[PDB]
Subunit: 362 residues, 3 copies
């Protein structure tokens, strides 16, 4: 009774201590595990985010509210200008304009020992976009900026004449983001942007972090473009289902008309306001792989001019911190681990498997 | 002589090349190795550090030193006010008060397209703490701050009347830290804090890093609560054995009386001063697992009022960088490595071990 | 035919599926792979970068250009002063001086509850260096700075008398770097430096990152000292090969004379200007292992004085990020993987190899 019974016991022990661990290794593979590798990549040419600069929100704007109060309207019912033959929705939104046509931007990438800074005026020029904050100015910042030392920046200058006639602005909402995601400019500039003064010139410094997520089956990516498409589609469709008025405001894509009547424009504005606060929760689409983080510090550097808005965005660090999460347990790893845990507990190794198969086939 | 001698040589070689490497694998396990994995966790609700705001140290107060110089005392012998019927120890700390009773704090977490910033006035309100710097104001900042965009901050406002009668302050000592560690507020605020001006409103921006240490046998954690308990107990006990006067000052826990006499209050104050400089070296307790680093940038944003202290702490980055060091060589790993290095050099694998055991038992 | 052929096929299959994977493992070792491990090391004593503070470039000096315009020359031909008996090249470069002899630096490392800040005036004092920007001041910052709280900084003060006689400066070029690399001071201060105002006292905060590269055969290091020697030798030799004038300017090492004539000094200046822009590309030597990154934030703190230049550099974070890339595939790893992949597909394990060797030797 001793010999073969003990052999059976000691062989089933090994079989069950190998099958359990093979199941654990294959059960640790179905649940995609991800580990983050971080790197500091030195950039020769940096990818400038494309800036949107806005006035403060309509009620906080110092220029828009001036006309609104001059027409008998208050900082609340500013959408009451629409029920007026001389004021349509576009006109009311051209009132918030604080950026004269002389707005421009240049790239200062490098410095000379003789000349000074290297000025490159001919690059992506700003254009006028309509945003929940009003009529804003969008800076495409499309071409890559060659990194030459800490004095590698972009200067946005609006040289308008402050010939005192009417009250003029006090601060601007800056927003750094990516391109063709036309909901970042037109919906989320008044939420994600920095409210900074334009009384005197100011400077930013942007460091870049890049978080890359794994497109694993239990948490799928979409890519920035599809994420923006989904987010904007949800934002607009929810705004329409919530306002229950088939029309739109200047910050929305021209799907349908502008309803030049205050009552159903207030509905659209309120629906936008209460739909853009919570769309990360209520939108059924998922994390971008590439998430770009713009660590924006403020620089007390030396340059003063006599112009309305003098903005500088510095890119003085070419080392981008990239944190990428990757599948730490592949199929090759799983198969090798099964082979090791089965050859450590049984000793049969593929070749023995082939020999056994040949014996079975005789 | 050739055959079995060569067999013996070639088997002892394998045995000694396997035993040495198994010893090295088990000798690399006793010395706990730790590897750091870093992650960037996106926070939906951020954990504000609970701020302590102090006046500058007694001799640098522009208010305390005023009365001290008005009483015939100088900013040095300021503890000589205590040998007077009208001045106790607590009155001297009450003289450093620069925060009127109207001090308050609110949470601005989000922004509207219509209303503007979302104001939440009812949160953890400041209370009066006694510190080595004088009578300070402590922001409990307990409730988590829901993160809406970059414009997620807490505003601390002290709207007192600057009706010019006496000279009024110029700077304040800010200190961001954690809760119930009542030595951070009352001992180390004048050491670890930022000395910033209150001439005009200022804004802070806090990014969070979290360093997690492994509680390995040769470098044990204590956890933040136990660390604070040990540090405060050591600080106070050392202060007492160094001052050799059985009494305490307003910043100390009420273990015993206040010794209302300048001679032994100066001893306590000097002992505190020279004991809080070097307590990391002289305290026999160990690194917290969670070390919370508050990268505090200064944020030239747009908001000015007409109040004495108008401070803003911004939380514009929800991505917390967590660097956790973990045991990179576990017992499962050790056993698997021993099995691999012994099955690679001998070929015997558990199952063969059980077979040999059965053969020995017959 | 049947069973012999099947055995042949099933053994060649294992042999060719093991040889291919062993080749892939050895082909994954020749191409040195590197993985980055990141740590946050807490420093007790921090390593200050040794600062070079310069006036703005010659044509942007408001003092140098003053004398240049006062001598009938303009701020374009400032090198025409050399064609004058009273002006040599050294004198023309002593004109850019904006730092009186009273320039000094001290280390404020800690704070007292009684005294205040711990002032250590006797440290590495600044010395007068010649740089492409003019006559600059170099702060050796040699001794390590004991880190005591966030109020651990170095104050550089130039207490000169502003007795209004001639126009006085308004900006300075700061540059944080390492030591004995005498091309950082003398060539690249006007390129890598921050141009900051000296109208009122300002403060920097430096956080250190350290990127360590692996000295792999396909991308070798040189070490900071050899890298600096290579860069400076290339810069100077290229400047001479491009100017085609055998002479040098004050910022150059005293290899040969100063050629006090405007025509062949302008050539040297222009060659320097157009050679230091692009020397990373054109220099045939490679990345330092240790790359030190000085994340410089601007710090709005409270310390104002009545002196010309009052600079503070704060070191409020002792936790240094260190990202080291290491060879993730060593020879031990390669050999162990080969042994595992041939013991998993064949079952031969070293000892079997010795047995086969003995059998062959008989």
């Amino acid at each position: 009774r001793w010999q073969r019974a003990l052999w059976f016991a000691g062989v089933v022990f090994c079989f069950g201590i190998s099958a359990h661990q093979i199941a654990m290794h294959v059960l640790d593979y179905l649940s995609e595990p991800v580990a983050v590798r971080i790197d500091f990549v030195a950039q020769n040419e940096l990818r400038i985010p494309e800036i949107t600069v806005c006035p403060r929100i309509f009620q906080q704007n110092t220029i828009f509210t001036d006309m609104v109060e001059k027409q008998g309207i208050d900082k609340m019912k500013f959408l009451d200008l629409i029920d007026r033959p001389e004021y349509d929705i576009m006109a009311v939104w051209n009132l918030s304009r604080i950026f004269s046509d002389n707005v421009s931007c240049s790239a200062h990438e490098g410095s000379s020992i003789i000349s000074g800074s290297y000025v490159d005026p001919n690059m992506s020029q700003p254009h006028l976009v309509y945003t929940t904050s009003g009529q804003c100015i969008n800076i495409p910042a499309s071409r890559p900026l060659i990194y030459r030392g800490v004095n590698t920046f972009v200067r946005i200058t609006d040289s308008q004449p402050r010939n005192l006639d009417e009250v003029r602005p006090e601060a601007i909402q800056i927003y750094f983001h990516e391109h063709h995601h036309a909901h970042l400019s037109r919906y989320l500039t008044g939420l994600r942007g920095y409210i900074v003064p334009i009384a005197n010139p100011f400077a930013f410094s942007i460091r870049f972090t890049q978080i890359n997520y794994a497109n694993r089956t239990d948490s799928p990516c979409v890519d920035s473009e599809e994420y923006a498409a989904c987010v904007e589609d949800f934002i607009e469709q929810r705004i329409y289902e919530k306002a229950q008025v088939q029309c739109r405001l200047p910050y929305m894509r021209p799907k349908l008309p502008l309803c030049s009547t205050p009552t159903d424009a207030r509905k659209i504005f309120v629906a936008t306001d209460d739909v853009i606060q919570n769309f990360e929760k209520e939108s059924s689409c998922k994390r971008k792989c590439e998430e770009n983080l713009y660590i924006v510090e403020f620089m007390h550097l030396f340059e003063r001019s006599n112009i309305s808005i003098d903005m500088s965005v510095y890119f003085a660090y070419n080392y981008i911190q990239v944190a990428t999460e990757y599948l730490t347990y592949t199929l090759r790893g799983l198969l090798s681990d099964i082979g090791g845990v089965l050859g450590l507990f049984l000793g049969i190794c593929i070749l023995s498997v082939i020999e056994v198969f040949e014996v079975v086939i005789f």
